[model samples]
Target: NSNICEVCNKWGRLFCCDTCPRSFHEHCHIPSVEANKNPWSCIFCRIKTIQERCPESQSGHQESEVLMRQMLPEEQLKCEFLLLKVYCDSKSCFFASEPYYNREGSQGPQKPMWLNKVKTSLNEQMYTRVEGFVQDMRLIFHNHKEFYREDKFTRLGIQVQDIFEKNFRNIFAIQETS
Candidate 1:
């Protein structure tokens, strides 16, 4: 017995990681997957849980711009993991996968942003500071807001925003009071 792809939301031909209930479509995942290993774990399952990395009292200090300048491979991996979490949060990666095209006559944002585009910029090492990454990430949701201003809100984007912020704080160890 199985369920939907936690990332793309499909079926059980999907790979269910040995460690978590998380199910993923092959391409929907970051590094994707294979019928590769036994007792395999999903990215979420493999990582150090948020609690271990950042304790409540362990203040979040310092500028990640420094971290960004010489972004270590491990830092890149953290970013990838964060993206994967966003994918999993959005169940349907519809808006996250690509920039929305203005096929209809209605107006759209002049500069479109999508999670996929952010992922690409990170892959290419284009972000000079960690703030650059943060900006692009926020732009995806901000552009969504602009496009849908007159229309109804995409609650999916709202939820994605929540997930991203909460994780972003924890991942960055940003210690503002809740």
Candidate 2:
């Protein structure tokens, strides 16, 4: 009988479990258990077995929830800022191979524009030792306006700018109040 594979949600020849109602495609099973095995259990059932045996599961789950709730606003802002910087750097790397003309002549494929190694400077380097995360981001935008001004990078810049204005600005406002 054909059953829908739980992982891919498609109807196919499936491996069925006598112990449980769960069905899985042979390829979907980790390590690919043999179908001829008389008794079989799905991955979820295996996890349930381990969890039931672990004495600390209930208390560990509660402690984790509490820790998640305790994250500070300043720390959250720092994480967001780092994520934004990484996004910009990744985009710059992706477009690095495209050819561009330099002052000397038509140069070879350009290196990543945001890295420290290249002769061309990136705005992130300027603020590495500075304080005030939001202010640092603002200064980066000011210093590298031309980087984002080009047609290829304008859309990415707009997304970064929108996040700063709409999301980070609200966080700053809340910080001032508290």
Candidate 3:
């Protein structure tokens, strides 16, 4: 009998890796494959192939290593957005599930007017650097602190605020003013 598919752990139209012994369902591959003309290799085997083909000192290998290490721009942006969203949700006085400082909310601790204005002002270039995005969020928190209910700023909220201020304040200070 053929080995079980690594992903679903069930028998299916499995594509066996030429480089390694692992088998994957056609749909179960991390990137998902429809049809393969050349020999199929799983992600692990592909990475290993790259590692073997490129020497440590070679520029091609260094670039490939960096590519593997870095997150995609969209993934990085999602992480940064989630961090701020979580912080906003924790400090909101109303609606436990929804963040008060959302761009689309009409009720319940609505996003600060200044923050909305800032967002509208930002162009594609402004948020290219993560530091700029963080700086904008820092400003939003600092400027709109009075809008949030005081009682909702619990110990956890206070701790998050402190951490944001400590990490982002200096970075904002060094950025060129508009």
Candidate 4:
């Protein structure tokens, strides 16, 4: 014989805890219950009932949360690049997305004309970084035999490739060795 859900009075799974022993229908349980192959906690009584019974813990929840954060540039690159590719081909969308591109008298004297013309923050930075990286790659490749031998170039090439990958990922999906 199976115990009935205390709340819904329907046949339910057995629920035994330190303080109480009862049966609750899947939905009748406060938080509801899910069954998995691994060890599982009663969602209703453990989380929901405890919350209702103890309101102070809820208010102090912030203290228990993991507050650690970091700026993941690689992930940012991939995401930003995806956005760039999607919008770059469309001039209207690109310009509209970055109204700052063609605008004049916006950037201070230090800003380059090319940068000043870019409207979107991502667009300006992306263009500058990608161009710079490509230039560096060409210089490195051209001087590989004289300055950096094949072995040295292989090591330096990784970094150059990384820069391109990062910039590329920022706008579009592409293969990455990393």
**Candidate 4: C-alpha lDDT:** 0.35
- Candidate 3 lDDT, tens digit per residue, 58-161? 23222223223333443243323323333343343222232445333223433442333333333233354454445555545553454444545434445555
RMSD of 1: 4.1
In order, the Cα lDDT scores of the candidates are 0.67, 0.42, 0.44, 0.35
Q: Quick one: ranking by lDDT, best first?
A: 1, 3, 2, 4
Better by lDDT, candidate 4 or 1: 1
Model 3, residue 128: distance off in Å is 10
- Candidate 4 local lDDT, 108-148, one digit each (tens): 22222221122234333444343433333334323322333
Candidate 1 lDDT tens digits, 92-156: 36556666557354677777788778777876888766667777777787777666655655565
Per-residue CA lDDT of model 2 for 77-153, tens digit only, reads 33333333333334433322332434242233222232222112222233222133344344444434444445455
> Weakest 10 consecutive residues, lDDT, candidate 3?
57-66
TM of each candidate vs. truth: 0.69, 0.33, 0.33, 0.21
**Which stretches in model 1 have alpha-carbon errors above 4 Å?**
1-4, 16-23, 34-40, 49-59, 62-69, 91-94, 100-106, 124-129, 154-156
The lDDT leader among the candidates is 1
Q: Judge candidate 1 at residue 15 and give its lDDT.
A: 80
| Count of backbone collisions within predicted model 2 | 0
Rank by TM-score, descending? 1, 2, 3, 4
